[model samples]
Structures are given as structure tokens and as C-alpha cells.
Target: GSSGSSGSPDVQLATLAQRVKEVLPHVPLGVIQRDLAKTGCVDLTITNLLEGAVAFMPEDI
Candidate 1:
């Protein structure tokens, strides 16, 4: 690794979380983050979703 990258990891987490949302569409961001915060990948989070491990989140929509 060239020059250790330093910053809050959640920044990256948030980016990937948004990507999960984009892939899954209308899946609540809160629900997305629950898996995303743990799974840490777009496809993995989606897989978590498809596997029915995550509960449905309330949507203001």
C-alpha cells in the first residue's frame, strides 16, 4: 500500500450504500445502511437483501 489512506471509513460506506440503493432502488436508505454498515459492498448488501436477512425499513415515501 502506497501512503496509507486515512479518513473516516463511513465515507466509503456511505458511497457504497448509495450504490446499493441505486442497484436495489427504493430500498430504504436506513435498511440499506444496516446491511451496508456490516456487509460493506454493493453486491454483498444486495445479496443480504435478496437473502431476506434485512428487515424492511420505514419509508417517508
Candidate 2:
């Protein structure tokens, strides 16, 4: 509901990202952030990662 002048550009997303990271400690928040974006459900997101369903990378160059 507010702004982030402290590196958190997307607090809206990071909320769920934190939960996803808890289960998959080896994964990056950005990774989950992408997966998480596709689907807001944390369970499915974890399932996708744990089940080795998909792997994603930032669209950065």
C-alpha cells in the first residue's frame, strides 16, 4: 500500500515469495517470483518446483 525506497520494488509479490522460499531453500526468490507470478497459489508453485515441472530464469540480459 506504500512505496519502497529500500530496495523492495515489489512488496506485493515478495510476500508470497518468502513462503515459497521457505520450502525450496535452494531456489532464489526471483525464480519463485516468476513462477509465483504465473500462479498465485503457493502450493502449486512449490509443487511445480519440487516436482521438477519447470525451471525459469530472469528475462534480464
Candidate 3:
């Protein structure tokens, strides 16, 4: 995370949503939200999802 200009939680979540769409386009939006809720921490959930996305993403992507 950057120390400068991370913005508000709403802003952060909007970024997260964009990242999810970019990395996991085939996944349903509700499914991502429900899975993220399981982590209890929004930041950690986004990190976990991104890590998973990168790990599972096709090389061409």
C-alpha cells in the first residue's frame, strides 16, 4: 500500500472491484464479495484475492 493518496474506504473498494474484474473476469461479482467477506478484513481480502488471481491467472494475461 502507498503512504500517499490511497483515498477513502469507498475509493479503496472501488479499486478492489476494478482489480477483481481485471483479474477474475469470469467470476461472479457476488461470489467474490461473499468470499471476501469470509476473511473479515477488507484489505486482507483484497490482497488475498489478488494473490490468488495472479497465481492462477493464465500466462498470456
Candidate 4:
């Protein structure tokens, strides 16, 4: 049986990158990083970005 633990930081980062691309296709990764840096919280930026991207998605109206 396999544990449900998530992989290393590199793996997590790659997954986050994919989700970020899905939400912000036109935005460049460097641009996103620059914008995220304004928050001054490097450790939480990935989680923040993922949540922000998902929240920004348009729902059926």
C-alpha cells in the first residue's frame, strides 16, 4: 500500500506550475512570481497563487 504523502518540493512545484498555467495561460511565470513577491511572503506564495487562481475562475452564469 502506498502512503498518501505528497512528494518532494520539486514535484509539488511542478504541479503548482501546471495549475497556474491552467488558470493564467497568458501570464508568464516570471511575471506571476514578480507580482506574488509584492506580498512579501515567499513560503506561502505558491499556496496563495493556487488559491487565487482557482478563486478567479469564472463560473457558469
Q: TM-score for all predictions?
A: 0.59, 0.60, 0.39, 0.34
Q: For model 4, where is the 10-residue window of minimal lDDT? A: 50-59
Model 1 lDDT tens row, 4-36: 657545656578777898888878887777787
TM-score for predicted model 4 compared with the true structure: 0.34
Candidates, ranked, lDDT: 2, 1, 3, 4
Candidate 3 residue-pair clash tally: 0
Clashing pairs in 2: none
Candidate with top TM-score is 2
Candidate 3 lDDT, 1-61, residue by residue in tens:
5766665556444455556656766766665665454553455556666664322222343
Q: What residue pairs are clashing in model 4? A: none
Question: Residue 32's C-alpha lDDT in candidate 2?
Answer: 84
Candidate 2 per-residue lDDT over residues 1-61, each given as its tens digit: 6655766555577778887888787898877888886667778898888775554444656
TM-score of 2: 0.60
Best by lDDT: 2
List candidate 1 segments past 4 Å from native: 1-11, 53-61
Q: Write the per-residue lDDT of candidate 4 for residues 1-61, one digit (tens) a residue.
A: 6556674445343455455556766767665554444443334455565664222332366
List per-prediction Cα lDDT, in the order shown.
Answer: 0.73, 0.75, 0.54, 0.50
Residue 24's lDDT within candidate 1 is 83
Model 3 score (lDDT)? 0.54
Q: What are the clashing pairs of model 1?
A: none
What candidate 4 gets wrong by more than 4 Å, as runs, is 1-6, 11-18, 40-61
